[PDB]
């Protein structure tokens, strides 16, 4: 009814989607020409990774 679509956690690179600390995921938004769109859906703290 609002005519909108929530973007999920997506990236153009599999390397930047996960960081090396045995825990949380990556947070860099753009490295050279790739991108990481952070989660804006209502499933922020849900849907385990």
């Amino acid at each position: 009814l609002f005519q909108e679509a929530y973007p999920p956690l997506c990236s153009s690179d599999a390397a930047m989607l996960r960081t090396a600390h045995a825990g949380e995921t990556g947070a860099d938004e753009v490295h050279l020409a790739q991108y990481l769109i952070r989660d804006a859906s209502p499933l922020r703290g849900c849907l385990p990774l």
Binding site: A5, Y6, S12, H31, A33
Partner: protein
């Protein structure tokens, strides 16, 4: 049983978006994601998500 109702959420992701602005193609550090190739395979335009 009611109150076990369902919801619908739509997700949107771009695939082949190339950042055309030369100022927008920036890296947060110098040696972020290095390789052995003389040309880094990340300046090329993305083809997947």
């Amino acid at each position: 049983y009611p109150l076990i109702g369902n919801i619908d959420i739509t997700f949107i992701m771009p695939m082949g978006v190339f950042q055309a602005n030369s100022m927008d193609r920036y890296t947060r550090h110098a040696g972020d994601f290095s390789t052995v190739s003389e040309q880094d395979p990340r300046q090329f335009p993305p083809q997947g998500i």
